[PDB]
Amino acid sequence: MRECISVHIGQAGVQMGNACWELYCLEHGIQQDGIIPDDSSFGTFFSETGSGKHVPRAVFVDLEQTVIGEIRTGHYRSLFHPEQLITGKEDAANNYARGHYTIGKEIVDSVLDRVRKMADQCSGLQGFLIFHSFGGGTGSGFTSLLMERLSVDYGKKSKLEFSVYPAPQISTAVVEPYNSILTTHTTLEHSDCAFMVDNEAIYDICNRNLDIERPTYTNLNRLIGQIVSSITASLRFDGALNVDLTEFQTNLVPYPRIHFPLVTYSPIISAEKAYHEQLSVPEITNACFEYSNQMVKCDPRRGKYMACCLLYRGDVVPKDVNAAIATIKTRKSIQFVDWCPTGFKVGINYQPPTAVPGGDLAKVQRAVCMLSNTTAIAEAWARLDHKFDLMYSKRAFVHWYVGEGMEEGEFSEAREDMAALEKDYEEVGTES
């Protein structure tokens, strides 16, 4: 009945998607193909055919064709519908203009059609899940191009996006500040709720809590795979207090332009050191509010919380959830904004998280995913805007962007909009 269309943009989204759909197939008994061996709630993500083959309800789009070409040769070659996997001629080359104005224009009409063929095949449309990179290229331009196209064809339908936000210190591209601001300016008015994660933050978690000194990108994706499973577990499984994707918009977004929650997942524990842990509900709930466990390298205590969604899983008792949240509300260090006395949205599900073979997480009994909107993220935007200001003041790389469909003015408009958003975060955080 319910449905979720997954759009995976760029190398990040495609590689994150590989982990998501390896988990979903495992959460439903699927056999790396559309086949199920000789397992009934899959309908939210998997379309079914008379052959016994289940087809993921996802669209893989990339202007580059090396990452997707690896899927077609991978173990999941025979899972996805071949026309879902869309590849272009030449990548965006870390340039927002190429992704949005020159190359995106030649693929957007193709991905949008395949989305249409999926939207009309659903008994009822619930929302879109967008996976993309914030660094730039396809993830910055194509997404903002696609987001604007979905906003008109589908209007009020929910649009949730998972963004790999740039890390404070770590960086892999030189023009991230240009791409980060340009995409944000064109996605504020077309996105409902953007869940942020940082590679650096997960890198800390992967060695600080999981005992691994060599995290690859596969490890980070498998951690992100768990989060999305938890977010969509209510649709996929039964529970005591369920939550729907359209509930996040109102619960987490007090104002239309402030829709950037952080992310967390408490029981990120090594298998060996799990033998010495009780892993009770009150303790994991407290771990969510520690700076040491955030998946975005932004310290919550530098700001004030504005909304929180606690999505429990597995063996959980709602009485314990009530107690743990009550104590957390008591702590003075954990500060909520005054104008939000009602601070928590709670969701409980009966399905324990499943562990991917060859993975790193322990076989936990119960888990909680926390989605918190905080004013602390205002610091990250200010830091990002400073980097953009340094480069733009010198016109460090402008000639690349201006010469591929964009214009000089858009740099000024994008930055001032980010200034307004940073101002807005300040007004929200002050009272009387």
Place this chain on the structure above:
Amino acid sequence: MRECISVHIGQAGVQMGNACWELYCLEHGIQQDGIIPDDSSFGTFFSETGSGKHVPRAVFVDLEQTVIGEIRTGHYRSLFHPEQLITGKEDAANNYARGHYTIGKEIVDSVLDRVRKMADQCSGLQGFLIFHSFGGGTGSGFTSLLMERLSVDYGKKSKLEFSVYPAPQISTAVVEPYNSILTTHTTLEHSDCAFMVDNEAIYDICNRNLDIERPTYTNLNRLIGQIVSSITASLRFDGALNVDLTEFQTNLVPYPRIHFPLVTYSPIISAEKAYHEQLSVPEITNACFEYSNQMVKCDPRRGKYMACCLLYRGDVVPKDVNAAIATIKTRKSIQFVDWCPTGFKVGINYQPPTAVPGGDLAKVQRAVCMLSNTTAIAEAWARLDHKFDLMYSKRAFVHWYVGEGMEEGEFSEAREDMAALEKDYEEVGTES
């Protein structure tokens, strides 16, 4: 229900802790792991997990990483929680300044967090047990740093510490007087009751009463292990007249700055010569007041008693305890201060002390641990202050301390405070 958090600092505390937790595991049927074979009062020291694994409620902290690294390779490798065992980069090098100002600052925020994760996991918090060395290094600086941090985060909660006080003649470090005074000055106002022991005193006992000419540090620790078991036996086991850790503070500490009891354990007898001893209650009770059995090389009869706690164990009749104490009160040589007509606190427990296999103590039937606060310890402080005065007058080793975060003035302030404490011990010992 009850709880006790054990913090073990430095090489002394860590190695003393190894004996304590080998005894506790033996006192509860534990099997050198968290497992109990196919045993119910452990809850005071051991946290329990659904796996059947019992996790000691202790924190091992050291700036050096050789002693703790040996635990991780020892027989109790799989007992402690790996994050309880905290190790640093480089030791304090017998320098108080390094432990308190330079290296301690980089670990204190880590040990304090693990203490927090234990304090909130207890049904009710009773107090802290601190094991450390008085000679110096981590035990002198880190402890005084940790003690001040616990004093604010937990306020009035009981803080009991077991200190390896420097011996009068025997010494293993050249700068002990500097470390001993500096740590004492910063622990008087943050510690409730400090139980003192001397290596030399136990060395005498180990050969004079136990027939061993080759005591290692393992032998001394096993003797200290018995004492702590007796102190915490009331919480761990049932008895006729129980005593709680918060009772020591009021029973033994008449004044806030005079909280340095001695220690004793009467039936320290070889197995072979135990066959020729009755080991009745009156005789063992009298042994506690003999200078030949004190665990601190300070003669009680050089001063006046101020408080005494007799913690009996095993087959003991309270009528006998009444008689023995009555006779001891009669003896004129055993002098109590006049302003304390009520001189004794008594505790009786039904659990006989357990003998560690491979140990030296006999399989005694009944035992008594005596914790006495005496003015005689004033002599030890005066002796210690004299050694400090000699070195400081020449500035013998000052340059090491001043150059690692400390300052010249602190030497003067620490020493004058010790002078005041020595003066205070004199005022308490005089009447009218």
Place this chain on the structure above:
Amino acid sequence: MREIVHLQAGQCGNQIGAKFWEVISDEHGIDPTGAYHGDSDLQLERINVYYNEATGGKYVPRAVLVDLEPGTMDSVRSGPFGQIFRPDNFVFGQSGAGNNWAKGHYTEGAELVDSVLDVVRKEAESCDCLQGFQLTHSLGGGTGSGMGTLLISKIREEYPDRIMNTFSVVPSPKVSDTVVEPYNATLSVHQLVENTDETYCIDNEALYDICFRTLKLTTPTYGDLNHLVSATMSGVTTCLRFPGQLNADLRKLAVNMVPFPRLHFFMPGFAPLTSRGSQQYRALTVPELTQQMFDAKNMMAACDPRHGRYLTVAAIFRGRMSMKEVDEQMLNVQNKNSSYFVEWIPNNVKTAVCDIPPRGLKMSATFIGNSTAIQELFKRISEQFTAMFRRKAFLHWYTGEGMDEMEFTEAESNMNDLVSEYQQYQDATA
């Protein structure tokens, strides 16, 4: 005769209702397949109050299950006593309400309410004598708060004279489970005070206390809480279904419990409640049952009666008892706590005694109390609502669905007036 038709709403109502129909079916001997296998014939005499009959002894509850999402009912029909319900009564949409009152009431439920009414009228018209409508929902959600109040207005406009009683779960003060609770509660209450006869306010936090303190339950699921709510819902409708020394019809309670039209918010209770180990240390007699009924620790609402005064009270007993004891105890309570009872009402207790107790119990009792202390609940919600509303905390989600800021101000004013009215009648004569 005197048939009751049950309406669900949202996930809360559907979960509570599924348990209510398991309890009711238990005391009437109705198997999960619909067949009757009871022993006493008395439980079958008045079985028409909730059930409709069919061929082969099948009995069909007069229940209407509605939600804007089918995930919840699909659990209901898949679980025990789910095949009992008539399939045509599952009226549902595809896109749920995002916990916002505006969507459930104006946009999402508006287009689906007609489908529900067509089932309600069909159910009601099959009743020889319709007593009233019974609605179970939650004020903090979107479907229950929005659609449930939309149904209430529609039915009240279509059946003006019938009694409508609501068993609504109220947001707890301690911790919330939905960030927009003040908006849903305030807007939902704005409708209840005008379009229902007797609302039974309950909150989960209070039921958590009862399980923790009284029942000494260490793993209280929502099934345990819903059983507590079921027992009180069964209690208030036992005279309609069983005989007794003194009967109390739903309208009998409303007359005795509602002095003024708008003061119709009750805080229920139940007794006996004892743990499995403390059962052998209790007499299980009228004097103690009446003692814990008025105990503030045994009430299913957060507000404590000690902070206010009882306008009225009802005590629906069950099981064979001495009528002398019952009256003496109620009088005994009246005398001791004379400060807790409003003085311009000479008698503040309405009594009833049903002859048949719940299965496995020799005696039982259901407490219903209309207390001015309830003003705390609404005042607390007013404080939260005005806090968020002062700076447009989440309005855009509501105004975008068709609402308007004026309605927000009207709802707050109405709730404040009700709080004022409850406070006004807490003062003695002159």
Place this chain on the structure above:
Amino acid sequence: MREIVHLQAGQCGNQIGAKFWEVISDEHGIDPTGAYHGDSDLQLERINVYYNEATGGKYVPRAVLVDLEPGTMDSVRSGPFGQIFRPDNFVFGQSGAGNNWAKGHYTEGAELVDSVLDVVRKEAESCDCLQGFQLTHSLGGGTGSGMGTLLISKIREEYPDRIMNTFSVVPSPKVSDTVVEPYNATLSVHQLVENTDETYCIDNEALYDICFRTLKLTTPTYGDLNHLVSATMSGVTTCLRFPGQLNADLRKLAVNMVPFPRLHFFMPGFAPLTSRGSQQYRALTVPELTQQMFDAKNMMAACDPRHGRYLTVAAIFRGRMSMKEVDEQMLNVQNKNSSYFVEWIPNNVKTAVCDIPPRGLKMSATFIGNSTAIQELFKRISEQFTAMFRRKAFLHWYTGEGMDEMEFTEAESNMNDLVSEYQQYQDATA
């Protein structure tokens, strides 16, 4: 009728109380499971004095067990006759008092006293006719001295007319078991002299003598001492539970034993007490029982009556006896020891005779003596208290919990006044 409610406190009270309820249950035929299997029906007629009834013949003691630490009661409930008590009556905190009166009375017990009262009122209100409250504690501890006196003040303020009798263990003169005894005793006594009707002062040292001298016991545990205390506590409440030729109610004793309001400190006794080997050398008759009752070596208090004078005396006999013998012996004692009895009281003996003796004994007797020699006990404590207080021996532990040095001075002044009053009434007329 004339129900007694038992209150515990601290480790001393809980240990004494657990033995008292084993003895009481023995003479009423109550099994450790709560069932009754007695032979004589008389022991069941007045069983309501201490026990409440339940279904299936289960009898539940009207006991309230309280301590600031649960280790002691967990021993109580785990031991024999521990499952008898009602689980709800175990009211306890987590952090115990460190043997300091300040913590138990102002800080630790203050926040827990309300929980106890809510159980006391519930227990008391179930009594057809409440006779009084019975408290067992110790003046040298922290919970008993501090919280026990806090309860005493609370109950006396809530039940002013009821009789409150305390069986308090007093610190011994010979050896102490707590360094701060003078502070706990002085502060606790400051409360007792104003808020209790009859205090039964006992000390362990005296019971050690009795076991050593009379019973010739070589391994006297605390169980043996507590049995002695139990027997006297059973004795003073036998007329309420059994018939006799001459009855003595608790208020009957208080009237006859308390001339002035503040002189209500008694030193109990018991008889017969004989070793296992000396039983075959005794007549076991009234003349000898009365002889050892007044023997200073057979009294459960340190103070010797020879050092003062008896203000009054009570002799609660048990077993079938010749009333002529009883009166003649009491008169015989009165004549010989005329110097030991105050002269402005013409008759200093109150007599009673219960018909049923304790199990295994044909005869028994309980002695209660209000003697001016008790002034030694308080004067001795005053000397210790003023010694420590003269130079702030341990005050910081008390003043830090909320107390103040002024309260210390007031407590000492009050105790000195009581010692003065006891001395004043030791002198003859004019």
